[PDB]
Design a binder for this molecule. Structure first.
Ligand SMILES: *[C@@H]1O[C@H](CO)[C@@H](O[C@@H]2O[C@H](CO)[C@@H](O)[C@H](O)[C@H]2NC(C)=O)[C@H](O)[C@H]1NC(C)=O
Ligand SMILES: *[C@@H]1O[C@H](CO)[C@@H](O[C@@H]2O[C@H](CO)[C@@H](O)[C@H](O)[C@H]2NC(C)=O)[C@H](O)[C@H]1NC(C)=O
Ligand SMILES: *[C@@H]1O[C@H](CO)[C@@H](O[C@@H]2O[C@H](CO)[C@@H](O)[C@H](O)[C@H]2NC(C)=O)[C@H](O)[C@H]1NC(C)=O
Ligand SMILES: *[C@@H]1O[C@H](CO)[C@@H](O[C@@H]2O[C@H](CO)[C@@H](O)[C@H](O)[C@H]2NC(C)=O)[C@H](O)[C@H]1NC(C)=O
Ligand SMILES: *[C@@H]1O[C@H](CO)[C@@H](O[C@@H]2O[C@H](CO)[C@@H](O)[C@H](O)[C@H]2NC(C)=O)[C@H](O)[C@H]1NC(C)=O
Ligand SMILES: *[C@@H]1O[C@H](CO)[C@@H](O[C@@H]2O[C@H](CO)[C@@H](O)[C@H](O)[C@H]2NC(C)=O)[C@H](O)[C@H]1NC(C)=O
Ligand SMILES: *[C@@H]1O[C@H](CO)[C@@H](O)[C@H](O)[C@H]1NC(C)=O
Lengths: 50, 86, 169, 193, 50
């Protein structure tokens, strides 16, 4: 929808509120999202680096 | 080989414990033995039980004179920079 | 600074070598953190073990000696202490694990319970614990008969005072 | 015929001066890195905007150099204070602080000068070739408890002696190397002799 | 036009990273003195009588 980033998406065990569209953690990075067609929330994990 | 410091490629994981040579991390070190590069858990030292009892004592009968060195930095190079000419 | 984007990364090249200096500084302070631990704890050559039958003249060291049924083979008081206290950023592990450091402190503690101060000057020489306590009383200017005639009272006071550290923590 | 703790200071300082020199060839977002090539092919109004970026970058370079020298001089001062304290306590006296002047019982120390430092030669005493003996806290004689004046009671298996605690040198137990305090019924481990 | 706007971010982020690295040097120099005192207490109180 405009949330733009890169990483690996997995399925999660969170439960948003019906009006909530994406989640973010402390330090305000996006770590979850809702996709606008399945109505399922997905975990976002940065792609390995080191 | 998978450590806790990461993934290590090109070193064999032996089972013996030596003194640390190159620190890898989380308890693992590496060294050039024999001819190849090996990775091992470091050893802290050789084990030792003291013959403790409640009426035994150990008393020395000889001595050695020891001389050892200790090195300390006292000073460094005095440098100036002209801020304008730099 | 850039987060994997070639436009920002090319502009950054115009700033010289600031980002090699920053990494050099952080590496220099991450190596000295392991040097800090090595010089506090590796103060023994041997790993000394304590005897199986532990009669130290009435003194009881059971709350500070290692416990096998515990996590990492820590002492009972070392446990109370361990219970009380993304984008280009990483955390490196320390070279000595916590198991290794608990091993070092148990070797120091078995060296002192069993040899006094002799192992820090050479080979460890055993001495019975109450005779070591009498030497230490001599070192503060009290005579030895004052320890030997008050042994049970001095041992009870020591045990009861080690029992209060455990409560207060 | 070792000195890495002194070579580290030399190397760190040269490595900082080299970075300061080499930052004089970055543009910091200007057209040239050399000021004369901005002055030669530009006129004051537009030379100024390019000169200001060079000034901004070089000032920051210099400030980083000076801050990291101030942090390193404070580490050298702690080392020199410790070396002054060792010179007073290890060369001009005999110390009892364990491990302060080498490993073992300090006897004496000698200083030597080094390129930006000092080397202490520590002479210590290290005991050797220990033997096993049987001990007792006190002797009982005539219903009296006897304690050593300075030493320990030791047995070779059949006979009791007094010895000094760091060197084995056995002597007879007499009323001149012991003192008396009490009965032989209160101390745990009295032996009869 | 994006060069001028990217440089404003680069300058700020460099400043912030370098402030982080200075304050860590100053905090590590203090942890170092504490560990140097702990090493002296281990020698003088644990392996001796002071
Ligand atoms: C979006 O439209 C699709 C169909 O175009 C919907 O997909 C159906 O979803 C239900 C689950 O509720 C399934 O049982 C059907 O089999 C799906 N059909 C197809 C053709 O995919 C989807 O539910 C719609 N979602 C929203 C939020 O409108
Ligand atoms: C040393 O002190 C400890 C107390 O911390 C004694 O161990 C406990 O004693 C109580 C009382 O009998 C028992 O209920 C516990 O099961 C004991 N073990 C624990 C708490 O782990 C210990 O016996 C003392 N040592 C000697 C030789 O008396
Ligand atoms: C003092 O006596 C003890 C006990 O007799 C000696 O301890 C021995 O240590 C070795 C370790 O290599 C064990 O294998 C033996 O079982 C122990 N007991 C013996 C030999 O009887 C200790 O070595 C003696 N100390 C000195 C200095 O001779
Ligand atoms: C313990 O020491 C005593 C005294 O040093 C030894 O007794 C002497 O042994 C010598 C051996 O040649 C005899 O000649 C003396 O007559 C003995 N008695 C004295 C000097 O009063 C004793 O043998 C030693 N015990 C052991 C087990 O070595
Ligand atoms: C030092 O320890 C020894 C052995 O652990 C003690 O000897 C024991 O003494 C008790 C009572 O005195 C006897 O019931 C045991 O049978 C003895 N053990 C052996 C193996 O004979 C000794 O009492 C302890 N105290 C000292 C020497 O002061
Ligand atoms: C050491 O010698 C004393 C005597 O000088 C012994 O004391 C005797 O002990 C027995 C048994 O306890 C008593 O029945 C006697 O009345 C005691 N006599 C005196 C004069 O006190 C003592 O038992 C001896 N101990 C050892 C270990 O040899
Ligand atoms: C190391 O020792 C363990 C013993 O538990 C054994 O299982 C393992 O196979 C050994 N590895 C090698 C390379 O010898």
């Amino acid at each position: 929808n405009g949330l733009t980033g890169t990483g690996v998406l997995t399925e999660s065990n969170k439960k948003f509120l019906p009006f909530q569209q994406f989640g973010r953690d402390i330090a305000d990075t996006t770590d979850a999202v809702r996709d606008p067609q399945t109505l399922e929330i997905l975990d976002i994990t940065p792609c390995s680096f080191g | 080989f998978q450590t806790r410091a990461g993934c290590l490629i090109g070193a064999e994981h032996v089972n013996n414990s030596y003194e640390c040579d190159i620190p890898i991390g989380a308890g693992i070190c590496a060294s050039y033995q024999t001819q190849s590069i090996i990775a091992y858990t470091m050893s802290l030292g050789a084990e030792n039980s003291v013959a403790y009892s409640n009426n035994s004592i150990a008393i020395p009968t000889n001595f050695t004179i020891s001389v050892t060195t200790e090195i300390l930095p006292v000073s460094m190079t005095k440098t100036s920079v002209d801020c304008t000419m730099y | 600074i850039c987060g994997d984007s070639t436009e920002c990364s090319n502009l950054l090249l115009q700033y010289g070598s600031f980002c090699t200096q920053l990494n050099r500084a952080l590496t220099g302070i991450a190596v000295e953190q392991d040097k800090n631990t090595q010089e506090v704890f590796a103060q023994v050559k041997q790993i000394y073990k304590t005897p199986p039958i532990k009669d130290f003249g009435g003194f009881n060291f059971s709350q500070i000696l290692p416990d096998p049924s515990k996590p990492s083979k820590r002492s009972f008081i070392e446990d109370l202490l361990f219970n009380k206290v993304f984008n280009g950023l990483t955390v490196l592990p320390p070279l000595l694990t916590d198991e290794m450091i608990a091993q070092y402190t148990s070797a120091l503690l078995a060296g002192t319970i069993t040899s006094g101060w002799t192992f820090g000057a050479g080979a460890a020489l055993q001495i019975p614990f109450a005779m070591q306590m009498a030497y230490r009383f001599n070192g503060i200017g009290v005579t030895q008969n004052v320890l030997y005639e008050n042994q049970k009272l001095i041992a009870n006071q020591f045990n009861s005072a080690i029992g209060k550290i455990q409560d207060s923590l | 015929s070792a000195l890495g703790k002194l070579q580290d200071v030399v190397n760190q300082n040269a490595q900082a001066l080299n970075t300061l020199v080499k930052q004089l060839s970055s543009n910091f977002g200007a057209i040239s890195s050399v000021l004369n090539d901005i002055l030669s092919r530009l006129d004051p109004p537009e030379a100024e905007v390019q000169i200001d970026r060079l000034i901004t970058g070089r000032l920051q370079s210099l400030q980083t150099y000076v801050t990291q020298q101030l942090i390193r001089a404070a580490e050298i001062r702690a080392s020199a204070n410790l070396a002054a304290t060792k010179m007073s306590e290890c060369v001009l006296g005999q110390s009892k602080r364990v491990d302060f002047c080498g490993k073992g019982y300090h006897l004496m120390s000698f200083p030597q000068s080094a390129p930006h430092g000092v080397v202490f030669l520590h002479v210590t005493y290290v005991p050797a070739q220990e033997k096993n003996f049987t001990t007792a806290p006190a002797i009982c004689h005539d219903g009296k408890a006897h304690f050593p004046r300075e030493g320990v009671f030791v047995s070779n298996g059949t006979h009791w002696f007094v010895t000094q605690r760091n060197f084995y040198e056995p002597q007879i137990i007499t009323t001149d190397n012991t003192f008396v305090s009490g009965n032989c019924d209160v101390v745990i481990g009295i032996v009869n002799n």
